[PDB]
Design an enzyme around this catalytic site. Sequence first.
Site, PDB file in Angstrom:
ATOM      1  N   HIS D  83       0.175   1.164   9.674  1.00  0.00           N
ATOM      2  CA  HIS D  83       0.835  -0.256   9.254  1.00  0.00           C
ATOM      3  C   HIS D  83       2.356   0.101   9.170  1.00  0.00           C
ATOM      4  CE1 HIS D  83       0.091   1.445   5.034  1.00  0.00           C
ATOM      5  NE2 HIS D  83       0.901   0.505   4.771  1.00  0.00           N
ATOM      6  N   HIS D  85       4.840  -0.226   6.741  1.00  0.00           N
ATOM      7  CA  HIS D  85       5.400  -0.165   5.560  1.00  0.00           C
ATOM      8  C   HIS D  85       6.404   1.122   5.864  1.00  0.00           C
ATOM      9  CE1 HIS D  85       2.918  -2.781   2.834  1.00  0.00           C
ATOM     10  NE2 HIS D  85       4.019  -3.478   3.511  1.00  0.00           N
ATOM     11  N   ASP D  87       6.742   3.870   4.164  1.00  0.00           N
ATOM     12  CA  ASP D  87       6.178   4.981   3.649  1.00  0.00           C
ATOM     13  C   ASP D  87       5.347   5.597   4.980  1.00  0.00           C
ATOM     14  OD1 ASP D  87       4.616   3.016   2.699  1.00  0.00           O
ATOM     15  OD2 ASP D  87       3.456   4.628   1.524  1.00  0.00           O
ATOM     16  N   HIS D  88       5.209   4.894   5.844  1.00  0.00           N
ATOM     17  CA  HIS D  88       4.294   5.431   6.977  1.00  0.00           C
ATOM     18  C   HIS D  88       5.111   5.235   8.481  1.00  0.00           C
ATOM     19  CE1 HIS D  88       1.465   5.615   3.941  1.00  0.00           C
ATOM     20  NE2 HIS D  88       1.494   4.414   3.661  1.00  0.00           N
ATOM     21  N   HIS D 159      -3.964  -4.776   3.871  1.00  0.00           N
ATOM     22  CA  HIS D 159      -3.018  -4.094   3.143  1.00  0.00           C
ATOM     23  C   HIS D 159      -1.616  -4.669   3.719  1.00  0.00           C
ATOM     24  CE1 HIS D 159      -0.754  -0.933   0.880  1.00  0.00           C
ATOM     25  NE2 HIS D 159       0.073  -0.834   2.357  1.00  0.00           N
ATOM     26  N   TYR D 190      -0.696  -6.757  -5.487  1.00  0.00           N
ATOM     27  CA  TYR D 190      -1.058  -8.012  -4.819  1.00  0.00           C
ATOM     28  C   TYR D 190      -1.465  -9.190  -5.733  1.00  0.00           C
ATOM     29  CZ  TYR D 190      -0.077  -5.293  -0.538  1.00  0.00           C
ATOM     30  OH  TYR D 190       0.353  -4.459   0.390  1.00  0.00           O
ATOM     31  N   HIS D 224      -2.401   7.927   3.248  1.00  0.00           N
ATOM     32  CA  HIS D 224      -2.160   8.726   2.198  1.00  0.00           C
ATOM     33  C   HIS D 224      -3.466   9.730   2.076  1.00  0.00           C
ATOM     34  CE1 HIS D 224       1.162   6.449   0.597  1.00  0.00           C
ATOM     35  NE2 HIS D 224       0.401   5.424   1.075  1.00  0.00           N
TER      36      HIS D 224
HETATM   37  C1  LIG Z   1       5.134   0.617   0.379  1.00  0.00           C
HETATM   38  O1  LIG Z   1       4.400   1.714  -0.171  1.00  0.00           O
HETATM   39  C2  LIG Z   1       3.293   1.530  -1.165  1.00  0.00           C
HETATM   40  N1  LIG Z   1       3.996   1.145  -2.667  1.00  0.00           N
HETATM   41  C3  LIG Z   1       4.966   2.114  -3.292  1.00  0.00           C
HETATM   42  O2  LIG Z   1       5.128   3.220  -2.630  1.00  0.00           O
HETATM   43  C4  LIG Z   1       5.583   1.555  -4.586  1.00  0.00           C
HETATM   44  S1  LIG Z   1       4.849  -0.118  -4.983  1.00  0.00           S
HETATM   45  C5  LIG Z   1       3.027  -0.226  -5.147  1.00  0.00           C
HETATM   46  C6  LIG Z   1       2.640   0.740  -6.375  1.00  0.00           C
HETATM   47  N2  LIG Z   1       2.182   1.428  -6.784  1.00  0.00           N
HETATM   48  C7  LIG Z   1       2.542   0.493  -0.959  1.00  0.00           C
HETATM   49  O3  LIG Z   1       1.830  -0.127   0.234  1.00  0.00           O
HETATM   50  O4  LIG Z   1       1.951  -0.273  -1.987  1.00  0.00           O
HETATM   51  C8  LIG Z   1       2.488   2.776  -1.412  1.00  0.00           C
HETATM   52  N3  LIG Z   1       1.592   2.966  -0.375  1.00  0.00           N
HETATM   53  C9  LIG Z   1       0.097   2.398  -0.927  1.00  0.00           C
HETATM   54  C10 LIG Z   1      -1.047   2.193   0.357  1.00  0.00           C
HETATM   55  O5  LIG Z   1      -2.101   2.486   0.081  1.00  0.00           O
HETATM   56  O6  LIG Z   1      -0.155   2.452   1.488  1.00  0.00           O
HETATM   57  C11 LIG Z   1      -0.648   2.845  -1.978  1.00  0.00           C
HETATM   58  C12 LIG Z   1      -1.116   4.249  -2.145  1.00  0.00           C
HETATM   59  S2  LIG Z   1      -1.966   4.582  -3.606  1.00  0.00           S
HETATM   60  C13 LIG Z   1      -2.594   6.141  -3.264  1.00  0.00           C
HETATM   61  N4  LIG Z   1      -3.727   6.594  -2.774  1.00  0.00           N
HETATM   62  N5  LIG Z   1      -3.950   8.019  -2.482  1.00  0.00           N
HETATM   63  N6  LIG Z   1      -2.850   8.488  -2.986  1.00  0.00           N
HETATM   64  N7  LIG Z   1      -1.971   7.448  -3.423  1.00  0.00           N
HETATM   65  C14 LIG Z   1      -0.696   7.648  -4.086  1.00  0.00           C
HETATM   66  C15 LIG Z   1       0.513   2.400  -3.371  1.00  0.00           C
HETATM   67  S3  LIG Z   1       1.967   3.402  -3.177  1.00  0.00           S
HETATM   68 ZN   LIG Z   2       1.549   0.143   2.649  1.00  0.00          ZN
HETATM   69 ZN   LIG Z   3       1.489   3.702   1.906  1.00  0.00          ZN
END
Ligand SMILES: CO[C@@](NC(=O)CSCC#N)(C(=O)O)[C@@H]1N=C(C(=O)O)[C@@H](CSc2nnnn2C)CS1
Ligand SMILES: [Zn+2]
Ligand SMILES: [Zn+2]
EC number: 3.5.2.6
Lengths: 266, 266, 266, 266
Positions: D83, D85, D87-88, D159, D190, D224
């Site tokens: 997706h 976002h 972090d990916h 998500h 959410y 993750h």
């Molecule tokens: C945009 O990125 C996320 N938000 C943040 O970074 C900071 S704000 C929300 C909070 N808190 C998001 O999308 O919410 C991350 N991506 C998620 C995912 O599922 O992609 C979740 C991963 S939970 C997990 N599962 N295994 N390890 N971890 C750490 C939350 S963290």
């Molecule tokens: Zn995400």
């Molecule tokens: Zn993420």
Amino acid sequence: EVPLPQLRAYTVDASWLQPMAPLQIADHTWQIGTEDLTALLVQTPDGAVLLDGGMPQMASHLLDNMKARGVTPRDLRLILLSHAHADHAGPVAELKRRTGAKVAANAESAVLLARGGSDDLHFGDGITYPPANADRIVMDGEVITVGGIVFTAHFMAGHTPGSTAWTWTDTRNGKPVRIAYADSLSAPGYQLQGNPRYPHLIEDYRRSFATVRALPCDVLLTPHPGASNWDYAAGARAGAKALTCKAYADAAEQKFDGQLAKETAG
Amino acid sequence: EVPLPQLRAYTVDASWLQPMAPLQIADHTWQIGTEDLTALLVQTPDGAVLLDGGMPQMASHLLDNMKARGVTPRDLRLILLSHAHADHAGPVAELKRRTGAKVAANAESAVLLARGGSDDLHFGDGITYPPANADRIVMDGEVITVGGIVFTAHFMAGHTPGSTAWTWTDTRNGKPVRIAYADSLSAPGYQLQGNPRYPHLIEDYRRSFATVRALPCDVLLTPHPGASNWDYAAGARAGAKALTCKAYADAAEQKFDGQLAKETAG
Amino acid sequence: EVPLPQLRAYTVDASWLQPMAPLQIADHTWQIGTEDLTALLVQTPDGAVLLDGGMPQMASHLLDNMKARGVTPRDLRLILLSHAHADHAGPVAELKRRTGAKVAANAESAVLLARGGSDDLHFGDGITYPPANADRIVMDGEVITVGGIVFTAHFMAGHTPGSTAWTWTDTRNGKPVRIAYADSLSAPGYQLQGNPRYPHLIEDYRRSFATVRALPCDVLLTPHPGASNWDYAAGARAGAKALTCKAYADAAEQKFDGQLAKETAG
Amino acid sequence: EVPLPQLRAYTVDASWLQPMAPLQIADHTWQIGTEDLTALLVQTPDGAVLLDGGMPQMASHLLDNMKARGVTPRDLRLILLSHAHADHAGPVAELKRRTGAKVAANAESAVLLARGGSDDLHFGDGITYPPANADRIVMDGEVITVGGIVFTAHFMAGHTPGSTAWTWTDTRNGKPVRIAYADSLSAPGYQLQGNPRYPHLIEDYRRSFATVRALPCDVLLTPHPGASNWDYAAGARAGAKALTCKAYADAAEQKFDGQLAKETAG
Ligand SMILES: CO[C@@](NC(=O)CSCC#N)(C(=O)O)[C@@H]1N=C(C(=O)O)[C@@H](CSc2nnnn2C)CS1
Ligand SMILES: [Zn+2]
Ligand SMILES: [Zn+2]
Ligand SMILES: CO[C@@](NC(=O)CSCC#N)(C(=O)O)[C@@H]1N=C(C(=O)O)[C@@H](CSc2nnnn2C)CS1
Ligand SMILES: CO[C@@](NC(=O)CSCC#N)(C(=O)O)[C@@H]1N=C(C(=O)O)[C@@H](CSc2nnnn2C)CS1
Ligand SMILES: CO[C@@](NC(=O)CSCC#N)(C(=O)O)[C@@H]1N=C(C(=O)O)[C@@H](CSc2nnnn2C)CS1
Ligand SMILES: [Zn+2]
Ligand SMILES: [Zn+2]
Ligand SMILES: [Zn+2]
Ligand SMILES: [Zn+2]
Ligand SMILES: [Zn+2]
Ligand SMILES: [Zn+2]
């Protein structure tokens, strides 16, 4: 009563659509388009460059001629453009889908390419084609290198705002050959003076004549071969009568001055 | 061992983020940004124009100041930009979502705005902001008219390729006032000579000094008010010490020449 | 020898291009397109909404009919689409240039609109039109409110991935009327089974029949009026024979099942 | 008085940014990201595929790990995403500039990628990154083939609207291994019920649990790694404790049901 008119297709002279086999220009540079539209293939050890593709319906022919030269779809790395009108950038979107190729263009050409030639400063929506995205934006004088061949952009605004000449050095019979692919310098049916969509049109054309005049230019090629007196159907003599860049610029300026005078009279 | 560095936010002097109430420049023209970032509101009987918005987090403040002036979201018709960096175009995407406003910009500014300031020629990805699309592409010298106020674009490439001065005539105490909103002429930490991403940078800056020198310019305003010696916190005296366009251009050129000399020495 | 074929224009039945004067559907809702293509104008105290525009060459006719209804270009606030094919979204780019209107669409429709209908899953590049950008992306079931009229999106993928029904409540003779503008449910010349560009095509059509069956639907309208048995040339009787949403869905499913059987036999 | 707040950078746990050397998953499939963010390299005789890139600042590390595997920039052909976002998909724009890679994504992911994650349905503009364009739009169930490895898209909206699982068959110790790269099933902070920007959020998550449950899934990987009980720092035991797709889906649904109950109570 009376319906609105049907959409009108962008139709062109048959010679613009007449396939030809690859015609060698220099050691690594080939004309692979049609009789009357240029599409230049430059083959390097590190992949191939295409400068222009002609009309939208030329994509498969171009890919056939690339295969004949030993260039597979994955080997086409870069597409460069003279300008983003339908008769020169027509097949770019499809080529990007069917090959590894990425497009490098200046900002003006990129925004016209991204709207498929719609909302043209002069032609409106009369000459549209499938839109494509540029992968790299280039500035005036910027260089791009593929497999050791160095392409330099020379902006020559006028025919479109983003009109560009591309220059590179190839070899022939051992010797360096400075190739200049200069864009169109025509203004076909354009309003030249006081054009609200292009207020500095005349000054830009005048500067572009000077740019073309000064290009490194052992061999001139143009998107419409007739503009530089190439005859792609003439085989070993295809380039014999080709103009110098200086003569091309002078002829275009003389034609332009006549058009200005006719516009004032009209 | 050692993780990669965290992303670094684009942080700025507090005064750049200090809200101010609307400050009148002329009969229909108001500064509605912050103490140290310009955002100009021009109010017409046929809707409002915004020139620049400042930083991304200024959107709600701008909408508040518009409401204080009697401009609802549906009344904002047009957003114009000096250049598409985060500290001047930051809130444009959000403003488009929250108002009726459409963006007019030149091709260079439009392509930088559409990538949110990423892949900046000088700053890389260090100063990004939410991307937005331009609704109208303008050419050099082109005019846009809103409710009878005529805005003219004057390209002044350098600080960014798409840097633009916008000029219009308002009134004051009955009399016409020619307002010039001239873009930045700074080159902060730029490689000026032999820059492969901007080969003609120096020539463009030199031409831009000349453009600014020649603008119709009873009142000069700049995106950073300090560059034209405005003090938005000084009330009735905010513009008392403002430079002429000629003095702004001369000062920027003297600074530029010094930077060139320092670059050669470095 | 034999040139490549000329580009072929997207030509349509004359009735699709036959202008008509505005035809009232309910108190604030009007058909303002042509005899055989729907374009719905919804007029509110806070501006107007257009649902579809028909073919590309219909822009000026639409603006004329808007003016006849008292809607100036600045008053058109929102364009919604059934689906982004040339015969329904054709004039959207030009309308955005000539009016205050912004486009709201789902992601699938937005990406097809942004490439002007090129690289269609079924038609290739055979039916292209000027590309336009969406200003707002909507999700399934999301509502948009203009001047107190609430439009709800109901996704009904199949004819295109982004095909959408729009529903709203107007009034008639005092009483509420639930209007359903349901998209096409046709699959003209489509490969239905095992289509590599649309693997779940059949399941999506089946779900879309069910969606249409269930819409709030006192009055059904469709992009091609004949699909819901409207006759826009029949005046006070234009809607007399109109189908219910249930009957439209049933007829489309019966036709679809026959096409599946024919495809298996072919 | 009080300035507007400074922009806040998207900061993450150090382990998300901790480089690791390539970790082999199967004969042609490698984890080449960081300790706590997945980025999968699939190497074929006809070029390489990257699934996700992690955070924006991971581009150079990814290119280093590709070089260690024998993959030059020209050899990277395709980028796929779970997706869009930050972090990916963070480094996708830069990877496209620095490699031959083209992006394939569904329409929802493509429109979010093209706005750099801005105007997120849940996060607003809080988590933006450099925007990139998709080169190919994929439909649910569509396949893409590179050097004989077949990647199948399985949409699993929730998500993000465009969340996708990618499946392919590699080999291990001679035997086929069906790999499932399933997207996140979290809903962090959410609003689940009655969300105006995502009205069918709950139904989409429920369908996505069922999709994940049913994937061909000898080995599950997730963006993750902790979500599927991978420990990339554990060497030969990195995958020993990994969940099945069924267990991942069940755990995500149980967590989701708890969040729904908490939201009702809050
Ligand atoms: C945009 O990125 C996320 N938000 C943040 O970074 C900071 S704000 C929300 C909070 N808190 C998001 O999308 O919410 C991350 N991506 C998620 C995912 O599922 O992609 C979740 C991963 S939970 C997990 N599962 N295994 N390890 N971890 C750490 C939350 S963290
Ligand atoms: Zn995400
Ligand atoms: Zn993420
Ligand atoms: C969009 O394409 C053009 N318009 C049309 O096709 C039809 S409308 C104008 C007319 N008439 C355009 O741009 O005007 C062509 N491209 C030109 C160029 O210079 O690129 C000119 C080439 S003149 C020439 N020089 N040598 N041979 N020929 C034939 C005109 S034709
Ligand atoms: C992207 O924004 C800029 N960079 C930064 O914010 C931080 S990095 C460079 C440094 N240092 C930029 O473009 O360089 C700002 N915008 C400038 C402009 O001219 O637009 C300059 C304004 S100098 C000035 N003149 N009067 N007051 N001030 C403060 C520099 S600051
Ligand atoms: C892109 O436009 C369409 N193709 C063409 O124009 C020419 S090619 C296919 C054929 N043949 C398309 O999408 O297939 C039209 N739009 C359809 C729709 O349902 O939107 C169908 C309408 S059938 C109907 N129902 N009531 N009246 N009519 C005439 C087919 S015609
Ligand atoms: Zn042309
Ligand atoms: Zn031409
Ligand atoms: Zn700046
Ligand atoms: Zn600045
Ligand atoms: Zn259609
Ligand atoms: Zn149709």
